[PDB]
């Protein structure tokens, strides 16, 4: 109900302090956000606490306000055919999926929130009166570049709710600041009368859907299943990024089939596998595995295909759904692996991966201390798989982990076992790892 | 119509870094030489795109100064009009009126 | 997701805190005779907001050396001893502290001088500064072949050169009143050390 | 506060020489080829530095033309104010004064 | 006497085209490397002459 403040008005001298506090109507537990109607003027502490400290810094008049909220849980709908995509910026982690707004976790916060200033546009009247409006925007994918954030394949609504898919749209944000994600997305800033005010290009290529984005050495590469564009950042001018074409036939297979190995791009490019330096490309499979991949990938579900950069052993591996699997499964049964230190291909099993990544391990594995097992017994409380010293791939002693269809997590390069599955019994099976 | 202050915001923050060729002549290996010439052309590409951004920023500032110029000259001519009209009118009209009125009222 | 939100709002007025940017004076410097009671004047920059406190170095130079302020201005008073002192105008607790220099000139046409006594190593140099009721201030040295004295253009300041070693005295102000300053010229080396006394070769 | 003459010396004396690539394809020796690309990148470096110098000279000439444009427009408006006060005062005060002060000491 | 006219026509018709280096690092043959550097320097010459005209 009704909200109150400790105060309604105040006089400060510059450099003086003050504290105001808000209380809800009912004695319940709520979430707070403090706000100020002009930027500068004051210093603040933890704008999510019910009682805020202020410090006058500049001559003027201002409004300080508090929003109080009855927050509740509401589930996402990020289905297995539409996963999360998870970019990174300034130590804030982005979520991003279809049907949802992209959302970000701040460095100075313990929960997610919708990307700040996402969906904003600005109007100006004749004779110059501005106003800001938030329209519904939904994305496909979000990534980082040149201290900005980027967005693809927009569903970009407007006043009167006919949302239009712009499959060739690509939007970009401001620059960052201290421990914070970007703050505005309106191409129509500077009409309200920081650096890097936003933009959009709306490209010219083939069917769109506009599958992925990835940088390289200051140079964006944007991919459309056939054909690709370079983006070059200018400094700051009439055109903050200039986009030039690169390929008339190359273009990525599926949403995360590109990775930066060594000053170059590894791509599953619809027909084949390529390694391009920018300007020029090669075929890493021409006549050695081509007719073997296209096959094994074609059979079940190609859009489940992924790549991951196993730096630790100088391998790049392309993950796919095995030859005999349900046509609506996305669990990658198998991976084809390229050792870029010698240009040599192999294949392997992986434990039904939904997703893969590098990570830090648990503590019991993280180079521990006899002084930690004060609750453990030699008698293996179902914990057995601990070798005094596990060979190392990395000096920070880090680990590649798979998020699995099998209700859990797995490490994917570790002492020899394999975890097969059994639909006839709906049970997991462990068996010795077989090389052939 | 104030000559709108310098848009201090067009090119003066692009450090136009003078492109200087790194020593290619000590690179006896073709692969290192080929990298060094590519790195040299990369500095050229960087510099070319900086000089363009400055040329467009220069054209926008010129376009602002031509809009500012219509104003100052046209206003010069408006104030010329003011001068002529007001001054001539006042001086002549009054001298005449005053002299005539007082002089006549008195000598008959 | 926020099911219900309610807002609350408050204005704040932020006054400029001037006199945290310096105050400035009509009465920057004031020379006066032994028991004159002169008024003294100062303003904060921008004329905005805060008040000031008036304070003085050695509060023994007047019967009650500085009178408390009215508002921005204040007033001064003096008693029978001589030399410079300084009146500082400190803002109410914060760190702005302007300064007014005043000379209590010993009499109506008298003099005082900066140092009493000086110590100089031979070949070195230092300066002496008078304060006077009249601008001509002649300088003279006994033993000019051991300590030279050379007036600056304002006459009230002079430069001293230690041409030789020994105890010497300077006088200044032909202007109806002559002051004093003692000067010791000292050796360029006072002692020495060696590495050994009980050697054997 | 006159506009400044041309700085007839911002860049119009800098012969910005049109960069033209010399023949690289006949240089069969890698060492001479490496010299010829270094010499072409040196002509690029020269032309890029001449264009950055001309863009800085243009930015300086625009910085001069914007210093020339703003405060002289302020002179226009302040002289315009002098005009206003002076001659408005004239017209009104003048006519009123003479006629009225003449009714002067002479009517009764 | 008149601030006469925008010359509406001083350089905004020259699309200065942003110079970008093509991949040189894969050209293992000196003769093909030599051509690729010459073609890159030709784009530089072009952009240099467009900037001089502007």
DSSP assignment of E1-54: -------TTSSTT---PPP-----TT--SHHHHHHHHHHHHHHHHHHHHHHHH-
Q: For residue B10, give the DSSP letter.
A: S
How far apart, in whole angstroms, are the C-alpha atoms of residue C49 and residue C17? Answer: 6
Q: Cα(A246)–Cα(A226) distance, rounded to whole angstroms? A: 11
D16 vs chain B: nearest CA distance in angstroms?
13
Q: Locate tokens 């000019």: which residue? A: C144
Asked if residues C87 and C56 have their Cβ atoms less than 8 Å apart, the reply is yes
The Cα of B86 is separated from the nearest Cα of chain E by a number of Å equal to 21
CB contact under 8 A, D44 and E41: yes
Chain B adjacent subunits, 3+ CB pairs under 8 A: A, D, E
Instruction: Find where tokens 């601030």 sit.
Output: E3
Cα A263 from chain centroid (whole Å): 22
Give the chain B residue nearest D91 (alpha carbons). Answer: B90
How far, in whole angstroms, is CA B35 from its chain's centroid? 43
Tell whether E23 lies on the interface with A, counting CB pairs under 8 A. Answer: yes
Q: What distance in Å separates residue E45's CA from the closest CA in chain B? A: 10
Q: How far is E38 from chain D (nearest CA, A)?
A: 6
CA distance A280 to chain E (A): 6
Using the structure block, give the residue that is written with the tokens 């859907």. Answer: A209
Residue D81: which residues within 8 A CB-CB, separation 6 or more? Answer: none
Neighbours of A399 (CB within 10 A): 21
Q: Which two tokens stand for residue A161?
A: 């709710």
Hey, is the C-beta of A232 within 8 angstroms of any chain B C-beta? Answer: yes
Looking up tokens 């040196």, which residue turns up? D42
Chain D residues within an 8 Å CB radius of E31 = 25
In DSSP terms, which residues pair with A144 in a beta bridge?
A149
The burial of A255, by beta-carbon neighbours within 10 Å (0-12 exposed, 13-18 middle, 19 or more buried), is given as: buried
Query: Is the CB of A238 inside 8 Å of chain B's CB atoms?
Result: yes
Nearest to B42 among E3, E6, E21 (CB): E21
Q: In sequence order, what are the beta bridge partners of A245?
A: A229
Return d(Cα C58, Cα C81) in angstroms, integer: 11
Which chain E residues are Cβ-neighbours of B51 within 8 angstroms? 51
CA distance A241 to A234: 5
E35: tokens are 């051509």
The answer to whether residue B44 neighbours chain E at the CB level (below 8 Å) is yes
Q: For helices B30-107 and D89-104, what crossing angle results, to 10°?
A: 10
Cα–Cα distance measured from residue A212 to residue A222, given in angstroms and rounded to the nearest whole number: 6
Nearest beta carbon to residue A234 from set B13, B53, B60: B53
Both structure tokens of D100 = 């009225």
CB C53, CB C97: distance < 8 Å: no
> Residue C10's closest chain A neighbor by CA?
A8
Tokens of B86: 């007001």
Instruction: Count CB-CB contacts under 10 A for residue A342.
Output: 7
3-state secondary structure at position B40: helix
Which tokens go with B69?
Answer: 């110029």
| Sheet strands side by side (includes A306-310) | A306-310, A315-320, A332-339, A344-359, A399-404, A408-411
Q: Does the beta-carbon distance from A65 to C17 stay under 8 Å?
A: no
Nearest to C53 by CA among C76, C25, C73: C73
Q: What is the dihedral of CA A166, A169, A175, A180, to 10 degrees?
A: 40
CATH number at residue C152: 2.60.40.1080
Contacts of E3 (CB under 8 A, 6+ apart): B66, B69, B70, B72, B73, B74
- Distance in Å, alpha carbon of B101 to nearest chain A alpha carbon: 53
> What's the token pair of residue C128?
């002496």
What is each CA distance from C185 to A17, C113, C170, C182, C189, in whole angstroms? 59, 19, 13, 10, 12
Query: What burial letters (b/e) apply to C113-152, b meaning 16+ CB within 10 Å?
Result: beeeebebebeeeeebebbbbeeebebebeeeebbbbeee
Contact A52, A65 (CB under 8 A): no
Which helix (H) or strand (E) is B19 found in, with range? none
DSSP-assigned states of every residue in chain C: -EEEEEEEEEEEEEE--TTSSPEEES-SEEEE-TT---EE-EEEGGG-S--EEEEESSTTSSTTSEEPPSSS-EEE---S--EEEEEEEEESSSS-EEEEEEEE-SSSS-EEES-SEEEEETT-EEEEEEEESSS---EEETTTTTSEEEE-TTSSEEEEE--S-EEEEEEE--SS----EEEEEE-S------S-SS---
Closest to B37 in 3D by CA, of A343, D26, E24: E24
Is A in contact with E (3 or more beta carbon pairs below 8 Å)? yes
- Report how far residue C183's alpha carbon sits from residue A361's, in angstroms, rounded to the nearest whole number: 80
| Residue A426 to residue A43: CA distance in whole angstroms | 59
The owner of tokens 């809009």 is B67
Q: Which one of B36, B44, B65, B73 would you mutate to disrupt binding with E, by most E Cβ within 10 Å of its Cβ?
A: B44
Cβ separation of E38 and D18 shorter than 8 Å?
A: no
Contact call for D51 and E49, based on CB within 8 A: no
* B48-70 as b/e: b if 16+ CB within 10 A: bbbbbbbbbbbbbbbebbeebbe
- CB–CB of A275/A282 below 8 Å? yes
| Other CB atoms within 10 A of residue A40 CB | 10
Residues A106 and A47: their CA atoms lie apart, in Å, by 13
| Number of residues in chain E | 54
Give the three-class secondary structure for B17: coil
Report C:6-25 residues touching A (Cβ under 8 A).
6-17, 20
CA distance A171 to A185: 7
The most distant pair of C-alpha atoms in chain C lies apart, rounded to whole Å, by: 102
Domain that holds residue C138: 117-186
Whether there are 3 or more C-beta pairs closer than 8 Å between B and A is yes
CA distance B24 to B29: 10
**Which chain A residues are Cβ-neighbours of E12 within 8 angstroms?**
none
DSSP secondary structure letter of residue D105: T
Instruction: Name the residue in chain E with its Cα closest to that of B66.
Output: E6
Chain E residues lying within 8 Å of B74, measured CB to CB: 3
**CA–CA dist A176, D94 (Å, integer):** 66
Tokens 């304060």 identify what position? C131
Contact E54, B54 (CB under 8 A): no
Chain E residues with CB-CB distance to B30 below 8 A: 30, 33
Q: What is the dihedral of CA B1, B7, B8, B14, to 10 degrees?
A: -160
Q: Is E8 on the interface with B (CB under 8 A)?
A: no
Q: What's the maximum distance between 2 C-alpha atoms anywhere in chain D?
A: 117
Burial of residue E19, with CB atoms counted within 10 A of its CB: 0-12 exposed, 13-18 middle, 19 or more buried: buried
Cα C180 to Cα C106, C112, C161, C183: the distances in Å are 14, 9, 17, 10
- Of the candidates A96, A77, A67, A86, the one whose C-alpha atom is nearest the C-alpha of residue A3 is A67
Pick from C45, C32, C128, C50: nearest CA to C87: C32
A vs B, Cβ pairs < 8 A, gives 26
Could you identify the residue written with the tokens 């001479």?
A: D32
Contact residues, chain D, for B72 at CB < 8 Å: 69, 72-73, 76
Contact C20 A31 (CB under 8 A): no
Q: Please give the structure tokens belonging to residue A197.
A: 């005010």
Dig out the tokens for D78 from the structure.
Answer: 């302040």
Torsion of CA A399, A404, A407, A412, to 10 degrees: -40
Contact partners, residue A361, CB within 8 Å, separation at least 6: A397, A398, A399, A411
- Neighboring chain E residues of A232 at a CB cutoff of 8 Å: 18, 20
Please list every residue in chain C followed by a chain break, i.e. its C lies more than 2.5 Å from the next written N. Answer: none
Tokens of C57: 């170095």
Chain E residues closer than 8 Å to A234 by CB: 18
Nearest C-alpha neighbor of A32 from the set A44, A40, A16: A44
For residue A195, what is the nearest residue in chain B, using CA coordinates? B9
Quote the CA–CA distance of B86 and B91 in Å, as a whole number.
9
d(C-alpha A401, C-alpha A389), whole Å: 19
Q: How many Cβ atoms sit within 10 Å of the Cβ of residue A195? A: 9
Spatial strand order in the sheet of A228-233:
A212-214, A220-223, A228-233, A241-247
Burial annotation A149-162 (CB, 10 A radius, 16+ → b, else e): bbbbbbbbbeeeee
Spacing of C-alpha C148 from chain mean position:
26
For tokens 């201030």, the residue is: C137
- Neighboring chain B residues of A234 at a CB cutoff of 8 Å: 49-50, 52-53
d(CA C64, CA C75): 11
- Integer Cα distance of B46 and D44 in angstroms: 12
* CA distances to A130, A131, B61 from A193, in Å: 8, 11, 18
- Helix (H), strand (E), coil (C) string for chain A: CCEEECCCCCEEECCCEEEEEEEECCCCCCEEEEEECCCCCEECCCCCCCEEEEEECCCEEEEEEEEEEEECCCCCCCCCCCCCCCCEECCEEECCCCCCCCCEECCCCCCEECCCCCCEEEEECCCCCEEEEECCEECCCEEEECCEEEEECCEECCCCCCCCECCCCEEECCCCECCECCCCCCCCCCCCCCCCCCEECCCCCCCCCCCEEECCCCCEEEECCCCEEEEEECCCCCCCEEEEEEECCCCCCCCCCEEECCCCEEEECCCCEEEECCCCEEECCCCCCHHHHHHHHHCCCHHHCEEEEEHHHCEEEEEECCCCCCCCCCCEEEEEEEECCCCEEEEEEEEEEEEEEEECCCHHHCCCCHHHCCCCCCCCCCCCCCCCCCCCCCCCCCEEEEEECCCEEEECCCCCCEEEEECCCCEEEEECCCCC
Q: Give the side-chain half-sphere CA count within 13 A for B54.
A: 26
Nearest-by-Cβ selection for B16 from D37, D56, D106? D56
Q: Nearest chain A Cα to E18, which residue?
A: A242
Backbone angles phi, psi at B63, to 5 degrees: -60, -35
Q: Which of A353, A334, A357 is nearest to A405 (CA)?
A: A353
Q: Is A235 on the interface with B (CB under 8 A)?
A: yes
**Count of positions (residues) in chain C:** 201
For residue D25, CA distances in Å to A94, A369, B36, D29, D45 come to 51, 67, 19, 11, 21
DSSP state of D85: I
Buried b (16+ CB within 10 A) or exposed e, D46-84: bbbebbbbbbbbbbebbebbbebbbeebeebeeeeeeee
CA distances from C35 to A34, C64, C81, C84, C88 (A): 62, 12, 10, 14, 20
Give B23's DSSP letter.
Answer: -
Answer whether C touches B (≥3 Cβ pairs < 8 Å). no
Q: Strand A332-339 and strand A315-320: pairing? A: antiparallel
Q: How far is CA A345 from CA A289, A338, A340, A358, A414, in A?
A: 8, 5, 9, 22, 20
What is the C-alpha separation between A245 and A203, in angstroms, rounded? Answer: 10
Bridge partners (DSSP) listed for residue C154: none
Closest by CA position to A280, among listed E39, B43, E45: E39
The set of chains that have 3 or more CB pairs under 8 A with A is B, C, E
Give how far B20 is from chain E: nearest CA, Å: 15
What is the interface size between B and E, counted as CB pairs within 8 Å? Answer: 59
Of B11, B21, B61, the CB nearest to D38: B21
Which phi and psi angles does A356 have, rounded to 5°?
-145, 155
**Hey, what are C80's tokens?**
């029978």
CB B34 within 8 A of CB E24: yes
Integer Cα distance of D15 and D7 in angstroms = 16
Whether A301 contacts A330, CB under 8 Å: yes
Technique used by the depositors: cryo-EM
Task: Dig out the tokens for A295 from the structure.
Answer: 């096959």
- Please calculate the CA angle C61-C67-C68 and round it to the nearest 5 degrees: 135
Q: What angle do CA B63, B64, B70 make, to 5 degrees?
A: 90
């Amino acid at each position: 109900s009704s909200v109150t403040l400790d105060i309604v008005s105040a006089s400060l001298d510059v450099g003086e302090e003050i504290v105001i506090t808000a209380t809800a109507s009912p004695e319940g537990e709520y979430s707070y956000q403090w706000s100020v109607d002009k930027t500068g003027y004051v210093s603040t502490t933890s704008v999510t606490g019910k009682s805020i400290k202020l410090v006058a810094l500049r001559k003027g008049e201002i409004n300080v306000t508090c929003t109080v909220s009855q927050m509740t849980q509401k589930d996402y709908d990020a289905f297995d055919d539409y996963p999360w995509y998870h970019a990174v910026i300034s130590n804030c982690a982005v979520a991003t999926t279809h049907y949802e707004t992209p959302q970000v976790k701040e460095f100075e916060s313990e929960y997610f929130v919708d990307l700040p200033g996402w969906g904003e546009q600005t109007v100006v009247d004749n004779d110059g009166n501005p106003s800001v409006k938030k329209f519904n925007w939904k994305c496909e994918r979000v990534r980082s570049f040149n201290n900005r954030l980027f967005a693809l394949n927009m569903r970009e609504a407007n006043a009167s709710g006919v949302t239009t898919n712009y499959p060739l749209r690509l939007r970009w944000s401001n620059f960052a600041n201290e421990n914070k994600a970007p703050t505005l997305w309106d191409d129509f800033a500077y009409d309200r009368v920081e650096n890097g005010y936003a933009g959009y290009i709306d490209l010219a290529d083939s069917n769109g859907s506009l599958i992925d984005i990835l940088p390289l050495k200051d140079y964006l590469f944007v991919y459309t299943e056939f054909e690709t564009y370079i983006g070059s950042p200018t400094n700051n001018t009439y055109q903050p990024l200039m986009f030039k074409k690169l390929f008339n036939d190359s273009g990525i297979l599926a949403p995360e089939c590109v990775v930066e190995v060594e000053g170059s791009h590894f791509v599953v490019t619809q027909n084949d596998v390529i390694l391009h330096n920018g300007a020029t490309k090669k075929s890493i499979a021409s006549n050695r595995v081509k007719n073997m991949l296209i096959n094994e990938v074609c059979l079940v579900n190609p859009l489940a295909t992924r790549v991951h950069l196993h730096q630790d052993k100088k391998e790049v591996w392309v993950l796919y759904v095995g030859p005999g699997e349900p046509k609506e499964s996305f669990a990658c049964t198998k991976a084809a692996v390229w050792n870029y230190e010698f240009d040599t291909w192999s294949f392997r099993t992986i434990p039904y991966a939904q997703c893969i990544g590098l990570v830090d391990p648990p503590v019991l594995e993280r180079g521990p201390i006899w002084s930690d097992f004060q609750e453990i017994t030699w008698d293996d409380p179902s914990i057995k798989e601990l070798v005094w010293r596990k060979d190392a791939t990395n000096f920070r002693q880090r680990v590649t982990i798979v998020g699995s269809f099998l209700k859990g997590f797995y490490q994917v390069d570790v002492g020899a076992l394999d975890y097969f599955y059994d639909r006839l019994n709906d049970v997991v099976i462990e068996k010795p790892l077989e090389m052939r | 119509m104030g000559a709108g202050g310098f848009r201090k915001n067009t090119g003066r923050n692009n450090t136009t870094l003078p492109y200087n060729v790194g020593f290619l002549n000590n690179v006896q290996d073709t692969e290192t030489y080929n990298v060094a010439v590519y790195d040299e052309l990369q500095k050229v590409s960087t510099a070319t795109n900086q000089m363009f951004q400055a040329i467009d920023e220069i054209h926008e500032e010129i376009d602002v100064r031509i809009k500012a110029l219509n104003a100052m000259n046209l206003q010069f001519d408006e104030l010329e009009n003011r001068i002529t009209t007001e001054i001539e009118t006042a001086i002549a009209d009054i001298q005449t009126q005053m002299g005539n009125l007082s002089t006549e009222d008195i000598w008959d | 997701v926020a099911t219900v939100t309610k807002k609350a709002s408050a204005s704040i007025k932020i006054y400029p805190v001037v006199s945290q940017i310096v105050p400035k004076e009509s009465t920057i410097s004031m020379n006066f005779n032994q028991t004159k009671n002169l008024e003294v004047s100062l303003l904060p920059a921008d004329a905005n907001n805060t008040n000031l406190i008036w304070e003085v170095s050695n509060s023994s130079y007047g019967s009650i050396t500085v009178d408390p302020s009215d508002s921005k201005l204040a007033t001064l008073t003096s008693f029978e001893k001589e030399g410079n002192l300084v009146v500082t105008i400190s803002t109410a607790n914060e760190s702005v502290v302007a300064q007014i220099a005043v000379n209590i000139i010993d009499g109506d046409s008298g003099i005082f001088l900066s140092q009493d006594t000086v110590t100089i190593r031979k070949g070195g140099t230092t300066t002496l500064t008078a304060v006077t009721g009249k601008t001509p201030v002649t300088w003279s040295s006994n033993n000019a072949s051991i300590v030279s004295v050379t007036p600056n253009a304002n006459s009230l300041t002079a430069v001293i050169t230690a041409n030789g070693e020994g105890n010497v005295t300077i006088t200044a102000d032909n202007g109806t009143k002559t002051a004093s300053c003692e000067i010791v010229s000292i050796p360029q080396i006072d002692s020495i050390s060696l590495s050994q006394s009980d050697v054997t070769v």
